[PDB]
């Protein structure tokens, strides 16, 4: 499952605001994926702003990788 | 159980008296052998920086982990409130 994580990470890295993927845990349950992602972000963004980035990553990542059934994202400094 | 309820009321109470914290939003704590692994989420001013939020978080960690020594691991994170 490493083209997929690669897919996910890349979908992540392209979203406006995302400084990098700090961490990903993705598992298959059947053929769906469930995953939890920690993105890196600009430390001078706000908590509000960082949350808006997390949302964006989620829509984008779940949109591009359709087999993901459930995805959580959080944000941290760079 | 009631001892874990006691320990949690203590985790909340330590974290809640760090300036910066607008509340405990969530707290999971469980024994892994004889120590606690907890993961918690603190409420913070939305207009705080990420860098700042992390400073509140790190400081909650220090307070909680120093007052409750049972705890071998604690991960703190901020969200708005």
Numbering used by the authors:
A (entry chain C): 214 to 291
B (entry chain A): 211 to 291
Wording from the paper:
One group of metal ion efflux transporters that regulates metal ion homeostasis and can be found in all domains of life is the Cation Diffusion Facilitator (CDF) protein family. One of the most highly conserved and abundant integral MM proteins is the CDF transporter MamM. MamM was recently proposed to function as a magnetosome-directed iron transporter required for iron biomineralization since its deletion abolished magnetite biomineralization and mutation of residues within the conserved TMD metal-binding site resulted in alterations of magnetite crystal size, morphology and even mineral phase. To summarize our results we present an alternative model for the CDF CTD mode of action, in which we propose that upon metal cation binding, the CTD induces conformational changes towards a tighter and more compact fold which allows the activation of iron transport through the TMD.
Each MamM monomer (residues 215–293) adopts the metallochaperone-like typical fold of CDF CTDs whilst the C-terminal tail (residues 294–318) is disordered and could not be traced in the electron density map. To validate that the disordered C-terminal tail have no effect on the domain fold, we determined the structures of a C-terminal truncation MamM-CTD mutant (residues 215–293) that adopted a similar CTD fold. As observed previously, the decreased number of particles per cell was at least partially a consequence of a substantial number of cells within the population that remained non-magnetic (10–20%). These previous studies also revealed that transcomplementation of a truncated C-terminal tail MamM mutant also allows the formation of wild-type-like particle. ITC measurements of the CTD single point mutants and the C-terminal truncation mutant revealed that the binding affinities remained in the same order of magnitude as the wild-type, with some alternation in the number of binding sites.
